[PDB]
Amino acid sequence: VLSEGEWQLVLHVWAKVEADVAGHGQDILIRLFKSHPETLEKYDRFKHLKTEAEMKASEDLKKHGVTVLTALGAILKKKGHHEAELKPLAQSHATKHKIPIKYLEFISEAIIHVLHSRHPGDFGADAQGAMNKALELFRKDIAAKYKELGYQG
């Protein structure tokens, strides 16, 4: 469970993300693909992208990044009270896209990397720790929902 102070640190940096959702989304997905190429090879929609420049130029990838961060932001704003938001996400990701928890760890890493790269003055040790807890809670709760659906991700 996160303290109220921890949630406030999470939402403080998230407001910075929201100043340019598309840009952050692109950077996060590109970082994910670079750091864990196996993730991209799983996304049929995007696996044709060969270079970083191609990734940045893709309107489709940019739109997707906004979809991803919008869903995550909606979850974070509930400060743990996120069952109604998390359930549909677990449903598609367990049964349609088949995304193991390890891949959610990878994207969590990319999120933290990009937030630190862009907002170091608002993303120091304590804020990083809080965001890490928030993403940990997200992954824990989604794993439980995965199992309820019969997926051992």
Calpha distance 48→73 (Å, rounded)? 28
Calpha distance 1→137 (Å, rounded)? 8
Tell me whether residue 97 is annotated as binding: no
Q: Which two tokens stand for residue 50?
A: 């060969």
At position 69, the amino acid (one-letter code) is: L
- Give the number of residues in contact with ligand HEM, rule: CB under 6 A: 16
Phi, psi of 46, deg, nearest 5: -125, -10
Q: Which residues contact 72 (CB under 8 A, 6 or more apart)?
A: 111, 138
By Cβ distance, which residue is nearest to ligand HEM? 92
Q: In whole angstroms, how close is the CB of 84 to ligand HEM at the nearest point?
A: 14
Nearer to ligand HEM, 16 or 64 (CB): 64
Map the footprint of ligand HEM across residues 63-102, applying CB under 6 A: 67-68, 71-72, 89, 92-93, 97, 99
Nearer to ligand HEM, 89 or 127 (CB): 89
Tell me whether residue 113 is annotated as binding: no
Map the footprint of ligand HEM across residues 114-143, applying CB under 6 A: none
Nearer to ligand HEM, 110 or 127 (CB): 110
DSSP state of 147: H
Annotated binding site: 64, 93
